[PDB]
Structures are given as structure tokens and as C-alpha cells.
């Protein structure tokens, strides 16, 4: 195999004096050799402090040059980074770190989260990111350290994704998965090796796209990763021009915002260096696809994928957002919903898209054998995406098998929000749905029934969500206060019908 | 890993009814699904006849759809194909088959070779290719067979390479090597996944370029492989036009011939479909490069590589034939000649190019661990090429460490020809050199001295070479008959003086 460490090590031997990390706002630039030196220094320090290979270490930080260094240093040592969304609140972060039996937690989020981890009794050593590396500069002691033995099936990285109930699942990415999780960017997207590559780091590092397909791929191809700490679409387009960005890979949400900024820049706008605009994370709305086609340059590529199996379908110069086909690495099937992996659907019958679990695939969810058995069956990964084969022989993605909402490319299950809002004073029933939204894809929407003879307020419900343990980004954008909810003859709420009722 | 069998199997699930193999002159076309069926049928038949996984099977045939089916059927069964140049004569072939402990030999080269194999006592079962499959149509019997378990380090394919002495060595290519031996065509050459790929099969299947980088790459990317049975430059260019070929990978020898044909044909040929013109196998002479740039369309890419480690250096749109830099997968060093793998020379000093032995690398020469130890040392493969780092930070390929001649992308050692000509009646002393030649790169040249007072003739010596055990393509293109070789008091040839005298 070629591990992340190996890809980046080899890249640094080929292009030592070429810029690896650019942070234009902070005036920081690091060559491949400089980055390597810093990764080594941070690895040596962690090792001197006692950290061992195969130990799990949480990483909870927004995108920055410092977190890039920390993640790669953990991997260099042989520790398994468990990347966590820094927008999550203290109790959720502490409980995930506890259940993960992690050895340390590198955080940039800082004091209340740190206390939560301590009080949880996990025993994870809390490390402030700024105490490890600051503005690219490590605090190091200790000799150079050995290379850990990495084995193909062995845990390498952990990424989290939402289940239909409970806390997010910890997807274990094996060492062997790294190469294909990078190289689809060559085979599908058409990136090629070279120092010409200038990649805009829009996507979060704590998800597989922002990590493997953006950061690792940029450096592994001997190019430059441009760090973006906060998404501002006007500033982003200015970076494209300023850094001469050649490729950008983002959500339909990002691209709706970018294409709008592009249009608003007027008839003089030129973004000549940009050769690739790639999208993933959610269904690309047709309206967004039109603005992207009309206002941004480069080849447009739709990339369908999952945390668990990475890229499974794609489309170059798509005419619609729903239609894609398997590329290199990939084998796919559409099977009867609820049926076995061999129960392939007829002609144009709808079913669940399932994808072969090969090199790119996760090896299970940490400490969740039941959740794993539901998703990994007879060599296949079950996407929970509804799909159909077209007369053209392509795959049309139609929606979810489950009730998962996808907003800003983030999976949010309605139960997360229903659990919280169900305890808000005055609420007698709550059902949460996703409404079609050009910007967000699906907009989190609460349908709430007040106690008889009482009223409810969208402002008060929103306040309650914000003070709750629920991540702020997940809270409802809109509330519908209703006297009743549509129900079947078994008193279950007709969720899909309700979507049509309030849309 | 992703084995050859998996790449091709997955391709066939994605593009079943797309053309995989085209032989336009025979009117033979086979879809990916049709090819897989013929591969399965041949594999089943071979298993019925007693062939088993990891048994070695020689393949001795020129390029054809039938040998493609046979090689892939052997692999599908789990046998190890050992690909041999069909231009080698019967004694060399039989002895290589014997030395390899081959179970069987699939031959399209006739009864004399069959008899030599039989009489050698090797016990290798002789199989006529045309008795297995002919014009794409298999003779099918036997029940379905299992797809055997394949392991990363397990022998997958054997390819032959010449040493400084003795018979060619059998380089064992492991299962794990297939993927990077294909994917460098994406990262370096810029081929991408898709049915748009129409690849012209110029390169011999019995070397690693023609097999991995041409045949397997074409099919694995869901494209079409256009079979070429016999190279004729005008006919090849007509295939580019007729089949709308998008990529062609060949030697500088091929390209010299093609560029001349294209120059002559001018506007009567429409070559604009051709998007990639790639070269490897020998130093690209600057005069060939110039005419290639002038007369052939598409992006020009020089690929440096070896049987043992595949691609190690490249250059897009090269200005010279000798300067290249490492691409994806590759890590290189230049070390003191005769020194250890850690004895890196100072930039600007000449030394041996060595390349990291990673996933792509062979695992050793069959039954020759001494020869293996000379070439595979502490995780590095030693190329026997002399090289230097340029002030521009690139690698400049110079000569050989070992006197190897490279003619038409074929390695030939002078000793092979010298040992044969030393027995020709009338010959007393012989030195064989390779003279610079635009078409062949190096032209095999024999400097010969007659017995006292006798005469030699180029015609008689040529006749002797042709009737000898030496492969015909290796025989001298030119003879210099001399009264005496220039030699010192030690009776040793003043090589520089000789080359000067005949150049
Ligand atoms: C679009 C982003 C940047 C948010 O926009 P922005 O930066 O303007 O937000 P902000 O931080 O300034 O706050 C502005 C207000 O918006 C709210 N917000 C934030 N995120 C979301 C969201 N996801 N949904 C709904 N609301 C959101 C946020 O709460 C704030 O309002 P406030 O709290 O009232 O201040 C953010 O949602 C994002 O980075 N999304 C990308 C997530 C991602 O990386 N997804 C892919 C993960 S792997 C998945 C996958 O499917 C896949 C696909 C292909 C392959 Cl090959 C492999 C895997
Ligand atoms: C250029 C070829 C096609 C020969 O041309 P052509 O087809 O016109 O010859 P032909 O069979 O019609 O007979 C015409 C007369 O030329 C004579 N000939 C044949 N081959 C050669 C040769 N290599 N050197 C000198 N003379 C040659 C042949 O004997 C015939 O005269 P005759 O015997 O009088 O009929 C042939 O030499 C060839 O196919 N060469 C390609 C060799 C090759 O595949 N090399 C790469 C192997 S792997 C090596 C490697 O370096 C690498 C590189 C990159 C990577 Cl990534 C991995 C590995
Ligand atoms: N290009 C795309 N088109 C449609 N849906 C997508 C695309 N990329 C990702 N998704 C959705 O996002 C889910 C993956 O998110 P996660 O479960 O966090 O890995 C997939 O199962 C799809 O529902
Ligand atoms: N692009 C190239 N430029 C110069 N020499 C090459 C190139 N490709 C292959 N070679 C030569 O061919 C040899 C590989 O042949 P082999 O190891 O027998 O497959 C190398 O050691 C080089 O001498
Ligand atoms: Mg913002
Ligand atoms: Mg011929």
C-alpha cells in the first residue's frame, strides 16, 4: 500500500522547496520540506510525552495550518486521529472521546470543552493545539522517532457520521484506504501529478472529503494546499485569483454561494487559473448546477460518495444533479429496499444503492458491531440512498431510505432535534423534516404541536435549541406551529406527506 | 489491493456492453462483458485440463486478441503467466521454460519450439494458443471454477529481462504491483476513467509497458484496446483516424517511424483524436523528439521506467529527451557507482540512479537470489543507469553502468553477440558496440578481426548470426572488419580509440 505518511513523505522528496501550505491572510507559507520538518518536530514531542502508535487521539479544531500539522504528526507517530467537528458542544465531544477510549485530545475549542473531557472520567490527556504548534511553529523536544509499522487493514483515521439514533458513529478508515481516497481525484476528477496544482482548502478537514480528497491529494500530487479558516465567498474568489487556484472541491451549498458571488462581481470577473470545480456532500440542486455552469469556469464534476466508502459515482459536465455513473475503483448495485445484497431490482424499479466494500472502505464503526453489521453485508456497503437505473444505464440518486436530512453537506437525523424540542416547555409533539432549499439543500424544519390551549413561539423554541446540547448549526431554520400532525392508522407521523403539506 | 483480475472484472460491471477489444482488420470486436465470458471459458477449460493456481505458464505469442484472452484467463484461474518474446529461438525458449519450472507453455510459435520444449525434458505441457481460443472464440469445456484468493506479495506475472551474462532473468511481479503499474498513466500521462479511452496497442504484451500500461490500463479505465498484430507506421496512423484513437504509448523507434509517416501523409490523415503521445523504453533522441513535436498531435510525455520498478521519472512536453523528474508513486536517489543505497552523490555529480522498491516493484528474479541481491538492496532497486541532478533540479539520464545496448527499446548485452560471432569461421576477435542511430537509438555494431591473412564478409557473418541460437533482431546492423583491434600491452581493447576509429 501507500499510506498517507508515505504519499506525503515521497512528495516532500520530490518537491522539497515547493510551497505545500499557503495561509495568505496570515502571510504564512511552508514548503513541503518545511512542513515535513514541523510534522517530525510535533511527532517527536508527542512521542517524548509518551504517546504510542495505534492509540486514538481526538482532534477538535477548525481548519488551520496548525491542525494540518497536528493531524499529520499524529499519523506520522502512528497514533490514530479521530477527527471531530469543532461546532459540536462540550457534552457530545466529551462523550464521544470517552466512548472512543482515546489516549489524548488535541483541541482548539478550548476551556469548557476541556473541563467536560476531564469531568467525563475518560482520562484522555487534554492538549491545546496552540501549545503543540502555533502559526506553523512547533514546541518540540526529544530525538527523531521511529516509523510505526502500518498494516493494510489497521486503523489509520476515524471520522464520524450520524446514525438514525444515538451519538454519531465512529467510522474506522484503514491504512490501505488512503491511496484510493486520494487517487479518484485523478481518475474521476482528472487531476494529475505536478507542482502546477493549487488546491483551495474550502472543505472541513474533519470530514473525509476535506481530508483525503482535498488536503492529502493536494500535497500527495506535489502541489499547494491553500488554507481557508472561514468561508467568505467574495474573499474565496479573490484567493482563486491571488493564489492562482487550479481546483476547488466543495458542497453544492458552497458553490451556490460562490456562483452568486461570481455573478455579483460583474462582467469583468476573470478566474482564469481555475480548471476544476468539483462538488459532493449532497444532491446538487439543478438551480445551483445552472448558476455554477453559468458563472464559474473549469470542468464541472459531480462526485457521489460516503464517509464509509468514499467515491462511488461521478459525472463530468453534468446536465442534472441526480444522474451519475461508477468510476475507477467502484462497483455498484441497486437492491430491493430491506432485501439482501443479491436482490437486484428490475428495469427502472427503485431500490437501495449498495457499493462494493473494497480497499477504500471503512472496516467498521468503533465499538458498534450491530451498526456495522447493518451497513457492511456480504462484501457490500449499504448507502441508505434511494436510486434507480436510467434507460441510459446511469444511476439516478432520488433521496434517502431513512429520514436523514442533509443540510450544508452535513447529515442530520431528525431524532437529534426531536429529542431536544420534545422537552421544550409547551411542546406536546414535534416532528422534524427537511425542506428543499437552494442554499442548504435541505433546510431543517420543525413541526410542533402546542399543549392544548397554549401557544408556542419560534423565537422561544430557537432559544431553547441554542442553549441545549444540540449543535447550533443543526437547529431548525423554520418552525410550523400546527394543531395536529398527519398520522397513519397506527398513530405514526406521515413524514414525507408532512413535507408536502408545509412546502 | 486491486489485482489485474479485479480491475478488469469491475470495469466489466461498469461498461459491460462497451467495446473492450477491437481488431479492425479481422472484423473482431468484443465488449467488456464478452471478453470476461471468453476469459472465464478459457480459464474453466484450463482448470479441467489440470492447471492450478500459482502454477507458472509460459506464453509465447505475438500480440493478438487470442493471446490477450489466454493471458487474462491464466490470471483469472490463478496461474502465473510468464510472458516471453516470440522472436526468441527454440533453445532459449525451451531452456527458460525449463529453468522456470513451468507447468505448461501456451505457444503460437510452432512445432519446432514445441519439439524443443518436449526434448528439453522440462515436462511442461505444450498448449497451442489456437487450440484454446481462435479469433476470439474459445473451445469450452469443464465446470465453473472459483476465483482464487490472491495476496499482495504473491507472484502474479513474470516478465524477462537481460543481464550482463547468461540467460534472461525472470522478474516476478507481485499482485500488489498491478494497480500503480496502471495508475501512473492517470497521474503522469493524464489518462482518466471513461469510455472515451481508445488505446492503440502498439507495444508488445510480453513487456510490462504493453501489458500493464497499455492493455490493462485501457480496459481498467473502461476503454477500448485496439489490437495491433504487426507494426506498420502508415497502417497505424490509418487506425488512429479510423478508430479515433485517443492515446498511443510507444518507443522512440516507433515514434520516429510514425512521425516520418505522418510527415509524408500530411493533411491526408486526420489525427486530431490523438490526445496523448507517450514514449518509453529507451533514451528519446532529440532528433526524434523534434520530428515528433512537429508531426504528431497530442500532449507529449516521456516516461522513464524499468521492468523491475515500472515508472520512476517523467516529463510533460519535453524540450530534450534526457531530462525527467519523478512523478506519483516514485522516490529516487543518485548514489556513488558501486556504493551503497545511502551513499547519495553531491548534486551535479554523476552516479547510479536508484529507485525505491515499493508496491510497484518486482519481488526478485525467479531462482536467482544472488542476481536479486545485486539489484534489490535495502528497499531500493538499482537501475544500472548513470544519471545526474541538473541545476534545474531534474534528473538527466546518461549511459549505462553495465555496457547494455538499447536498440528499439530492447536491452541487448554486447557479450551475447560477441560469444556467437567468436565462433564464426574466420573470426579471431570481436567487440560489439552500440552506435548512435536515430531510428534504433543504438545500432548493434560488430568490430571483427579475421584469422591471419584471411578476409571476412558482412554477409557471411550475418548468415551465421541468423543460423545461430541468437535472436535475429539482436544481430549486428553493421560490421567493421579490421586488421587488428586497438589494444594495449596487456592485450586489452582501447575502447575509446575503437569507437573513434569506427564512428
Ligand atoms: C457550508 C458551510 C461552510 C457552512 O457555511 P458558513 O461557513 O457560511 O457557516 P458559518 O459557520 O459562517 O455560520 C453561518 C450560519 O449558518 C449555520 N450553519 C452552519 N452550517 C450549517 C449547516 N450545515 N446547515 C444549516 N446551517 C448551518 C450556522 O449555525 C450559522 O448560524 P448561527 O448559528 O445562527 O450563527 C458548512 O456547512 C460546511 O463546511 N459544510 C461542508 C460539510 C462537509 O464537509 N461535508 C462532506 C462530508 S463527507 C460526506 C460525503 O458525503 C462524501 C462525499 C463524497 C465523497 Cl468522495 C466522500 C464523502
Ligand atoms: C520497434 C519494434 C516494433 C520493431 O520494429 P518492426 O515491427 O518494424 O520490426 P519487424 O519485426 O517488422 O522486423 C523488421 C526488422 O527489424 C529488426 N528488429 C526488430 N526489432 C529490433 C530491435 N529491437 N532492434 C534492432 N532490430 C530489430 C528485425 O530483425 C527485422 O529484420 P529481419 O530480421 O532482417 O527481418 C520492436 O523493436 C518493439 O516492439 N520494440 C518495443 C520494445 C519494448 O516493448 N520495450 C519496453 C519493454 S519494458 C522496458 C522499459 O524500459 C520500461 C519503460 C517504462 C516503464 Cl513505465 C516500464 C518499463
Ligand atoms: N454527489 C452527491 N449527490 C447526491 N448525494 C450525495 C453526494 N455526495 C454525498 N451525498 C449524500 O451524502 C451521504 C454521505 O454522507 P456521510 O454519511 O456523512 O458520509 C450519501 O449517502 C448521500 O446521501
Ligand atoms: N524514458 C526513458 N529514457 C531513457 N531510458 C529509458 C527510458 N525508459 C526506459 N529506459 C531504459 O530502459 C531500461 C529498462 O529496461 P528493462 O529494465 O529491461 O525493462 C532502463 O534502465 C533505461 O536504461
Ligand atoms: Mg461565516
Ligand atoms: Mg513486421
CATH code at position B470 = 3.30.300.30
User: Does the beta-carbon distance from A10 to B330 stay under 8 Å?
Assistant: yes
Neighbours of B288 (CB within 10 A): 25
Q: Which helix (H) or strand (E) holds B127?
A: strand B125-128
Q: How far apart are CA B341 and CA B383, in angstroms?
A: 12
Q: How many angstroms is the resolution?
A: 2.0
CATH number at residue B377: 2.30.38.10
Q: Which residues contact B438 (CB under 8 A, 6 or more apart)?
A: B256, B285, B287, B288
3-state secondary structure A49-64: CCCCCCCEEEEECCCC
Please check whether residues B278 and B328 belong to one and the same domain. Answer: no
Measured over the CA atoms of residue B82, residue B83, residue B88 and residue B90, the dihedral's sign is: positive
- B3 contacts B178 by C-beta, under 8 angstroms: yes
Grid coordinates in use for B239?
487506425
CA nearest neighbour of A106 among A131, A130, A85, A129: A129
What method did the depositors use to determine the structure?
A: X-ray
Cα distances (angstroms) measured from residue A385 to each of A190, A352, A398:
26, 6, 7
- Shortest Cα distance, chain A CAs vs residue B285, angstroms: 25
Among A residues 214-233, those touching chain B with beta carbons less than 8 Å apart: 220-222
Please check whether residues A64 and A118 belong to one and the same domain. Answer: yes
Q: How far apart are CA A57 and CA A75, in angstroms?
A: 10
Please check whether residues B370 and B476 belong to one and the same domain. Answer: no
Helix (H, G, I), strand (E, B) or coil at A231: coil
Neighbours of B26 (CB within 10 A): 13
Q: How far apart are CA B38 and CA B46, in angstroms?
A: 12
One-character DSSP codes across B326-364: --TT--EEEE-TTS-TT-BPPTTS-EEEEEE--TTS---
CA nearest neighbour of B160 among B241, B219, B95, B248: B95
Please check whether residues A190 and A317 belong to one and the same domain. Answer: yes
CA–CA–CA angle B150, B154, B158 (5° rounding): 115
- B53 contacts B149 by C-beta, under 8 angstroms: no
| Nearest-atom index, ligand 2, CA of B282 | 51
Q: The domain containing residue A288 runs over which residues?
A: 175-321
What A111-119 contacts at long range (C-beta under 8 Å, 24+ apart), as own/partner pairs, is A113/A60, A115/A90, A116/A90, A116/A91, A117/A93, A119/A94
Q: Considering CB atoms only, which of B10, B192, B328 is closest to A221? A: B328
10 Å CB burial of residue B119 (0-12, 13-18, 19+) is exposed
Measured over the CA atoms of residue B199, residue B204, residue B210 and residue B216, the dihedral's sign is: positive
Alpha-carbon torsion angle B237, B241, B245, B250, nearest 10: 10
Name the residues around ion ligand 6, CB cutoff 5 A. B 230
Please check whether residues B29 and B142 belong to one and the same domain. Answer: yes
Partners of residue A19 on adjacent β-strands: A31
| Nearest-atom index, ligand 1, CA of A231 | 7
Q: How far apart are CA B237 and CA B254, in angstroms?
A: 12
Q: Which helix (H) or strand (E) holds B32?
A: helix B32-48
**What is the CA(B474)–ligand 2 centre distance, in A?**
10
Q: How far apart are CA B358 and CA B179, in angstroms?
A: 12
Q: How far apart are CA B320 and CA B394, in angstroms?
A: 12
10 Å CB burial of residue A134 (0-12, 13-18, 19+) is middle
CA–CA–CA angle A58, A59, A63 (5° rounding): 165
Please check whether residues B358 and B306 belong to one and the same domain. Answer: no
Grid coordinates in use for A461?
423554541
Please check whether residues B390 and B413 belong to one and the same domain. Answer: no
**Where is the domain boundary, B156, B174, B192?**
B174
- B364 contacts B346 by C-beta, under 8 angstroms: no
Grid coordinates in use for B453?
591473412
Q: Which residues line ligand 2 (CB under 6 A)?
A: B 203-204, 207-210, 213, 231, 251, 253-254, 280-281, 303, 305-307, 310-311, 407-410, 440, 472-473
User: Does the beta-carbon distance from B358 to A2 stay under 8 Å?
Assistant: yes
Please check whether residues B390 and B498 belong to one and the same domain. Answer: no
Helix (H, G, I), strand (E, B) or coil at B99: helix
CATH number at residue A200: 3.40.50.980
Buried-state track B232-252, b at ≥16 Cβ within 10 A, e below 16: ebeebbebbbebebbbbbbbb
Q: Which helix (H) or strand (E) holds A239?
A: helix A233-243
One-character DSSP codes across B132-189: HEETTEE---S---------TTSEEEEEEE--SSSSPEEEEEEGGGHHHHHHHHHHTS
Please check whether residues B305 and B332 belong to one and the same domain. Answer: no
- B352 contacts B334 by C-beta, under 8 angstroms: yes
Q: Provide the domain count of chain B.
A: 4
Q: How far apart are CA A413 and CA A433, in angstroms?
A: 9
CA–CA–CA angle B250, B201, B285 (5° rounding): 5
Partners of residue A306 on adjacent β-strands: A310
CA nearest neighbour of B411 among B283, B239, B260, B502: B283
Q: How far apart are CA B139 and CA A455, in angstroms?
A: 81
Please check whether residues B288 and B238 belong to one and the same domain. Answer: yes
CA-only gyration radius of chain B, Å: 23
Helix (H, G, I), strand (E, B) or coil at A97: helix
Q: What is the DSSP letter of A209?
A: I
**Where is the domain boundary, A321, A337, A362?**
A321
Measured over the CA atoms of residue B203, residue B207, residue B209 and residue B211, the dihedral's sign is: positive
Please check whether residues B240 and B144 belong to one and the same domain. Answer: no
Please check whether residues A133 and A182 belong to one and the same domain. Answer: no
Grid coordinates in use for A492?
405514526
**Where is the domain boundary, A174, A199, A226?**
A174
Neighbours of A392 (CB within 10 A): 9
- Which residue on chain B is closest to A218 by alpha carbon? B328
- A201 contacts A215 by C-beta, under 8 angstroms: yes
Q: A224-227 and A19-23: which strand pairing?
A: parallel
In the block, residue with C-alpha cell 410542533 = A448
Cβ contacts (< 8 Å) between B220 and chain A: which residues? 328
Amino acid at each position: 500500500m501507500q499510506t498517507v505518511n508515505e504519499m506525503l513523505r515521497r512528495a516532500a522528496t520530490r518537491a522539497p522547496d515547493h510551497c505545500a501550505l499557503a495561509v495568505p491572510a496570515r502571510g504564512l507559507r511552508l514548503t513541503h520540506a518545511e512542513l515535513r520538518a514541523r510534522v517530525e518536530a510535533v511527532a517527536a514531542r508527542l512521542h517524548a510525552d509518551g504517546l504510542r502508535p495505534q492509540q486514538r487521539v481526538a482532534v477538535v479544531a477548525p481548519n488551520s495550518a496548525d491542525v494540518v500539522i497536528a493531524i499529520l504528526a499524529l499519523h506520522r507517530l502512528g497514533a490514530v486521529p479521530a477527527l471531530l467537528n469543532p461546532r459540536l458542544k462540550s457534552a457530545e465531544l466529551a462523550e464521544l472521546i470517552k466512548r472512543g477510549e482515546m489516549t489524548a485530545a488535541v483541541i482548539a475549542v478550548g476551556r469548557q470543552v476541556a473541563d467536560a473531557i476531564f469531568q467525563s472520567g475518560s482520562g484522555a490527556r487534554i492538549i491545546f493545539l496552540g501549545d503543540l504548534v502555533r502559526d506553523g511553529e512547533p514546541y518540540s523536544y526529544g530525538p527523531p522517532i521511529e516509523d510505526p509499522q502500518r498494516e493494510p487493514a489497521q486503523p489509520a483515521f476515524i471520522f464520524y457520521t450520524s446514525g438514525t439514533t444515538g451519538l454519531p458513529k465512529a467510522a474506522i478508515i484503514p491504512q490501505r484506504a488512503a491511496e484510493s481516497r486520494v487517487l479518484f481525484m485523478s481518475t474521476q476528477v482528472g487531476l494529475r501529478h505536478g507542482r502546477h496544482n493549487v488546491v483551495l482548502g474550502l472543505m472541513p478537514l474533519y470530514h473525509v472529503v476535506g481530508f483525503f480528497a482535498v488536503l492529502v491529494a493536494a500535497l500527495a500530487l506535489d502541489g499547494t494546499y491553500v488554507v481557508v479558516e472561514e468561508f467568505r465567498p467574495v474573499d474565496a474568489l479573490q484567493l482563486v485569483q491571488q493564489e492562482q487556484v487550479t481546483s476547488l472541491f466543495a458542497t453544492p451549498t458552497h458553490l451556490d454561494a460562490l456562483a452568486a458571488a461570481a455573478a455579483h462581481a460583474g462582467s469583468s470577473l476573470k478566474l482564469d487559473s481555475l480548471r476544476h470545480v468539483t462538488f459532493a456532500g449532497a444532491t446538487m440542486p439543478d438551480a445551483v448546477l445552472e448558476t455554477v455552469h453559468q458563472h464559474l469556469p473549469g470542468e464541472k464534476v459531480n462526485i457521489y460518495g460516503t464517509t464509509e466508502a468514499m467515491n462511488s459515482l461521478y459525472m463530468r459536465q453534468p446536465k442534472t444533479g441526480t444522474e451519475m455513473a461508477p468510476g475507477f475503483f467502484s462497483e455498484v448495485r441497486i437492491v430491493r429496499i430491506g432485501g439482501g445484497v443479491d436482490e437486484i431490482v428490475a428495469n427502472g424499479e427503485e431500490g437501495e444503492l449498495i457499493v462494493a466494500a473494497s480497499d477504500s472502505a471503512f472496516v467498521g464503526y468503533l465499538n458498534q458491531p450491530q451498526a456495522t453489521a447493518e451497513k457492511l453485508q456480504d462484501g457490500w456497503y449499504r448507502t441508505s440512498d434511494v436510486a434507480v437505473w436510467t434507460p441510459e444505464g446511469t444511476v439516478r440518486i432520488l433521496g434517502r431510505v431513512d429520514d436523514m436530512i442533509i443540510s450544508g453537506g452535513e447529515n442530520i437525523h431528525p431524532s437529534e432535534i426531536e429529542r431536544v424540542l420534545g422537552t421544550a416547555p409547551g411542546v406536546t409533539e414535534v416532528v422534524v423534516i427537511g425542506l428543499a432549499d437552494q442554499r442548504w439543500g435541505q433546510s431543517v424544519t420543525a413541526c410542533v404541536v402546542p399543549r392544548l390551549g397554549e401557544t408556542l413561539s419560534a423565537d422561544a423554541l430557537d432559544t431553547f435549541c441554542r442553549s441545549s446540547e444540540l449543535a447550533d448549526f443543526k437547529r431548525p431554520k423554520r418552525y410550523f406551529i400546527l394543531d395536529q400532525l398527519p398520522k397513519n392508522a397506527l398513530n405514526k407521523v406521515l413524514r414525507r406527506q408532512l413535507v408536502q403539506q408545509v412546502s
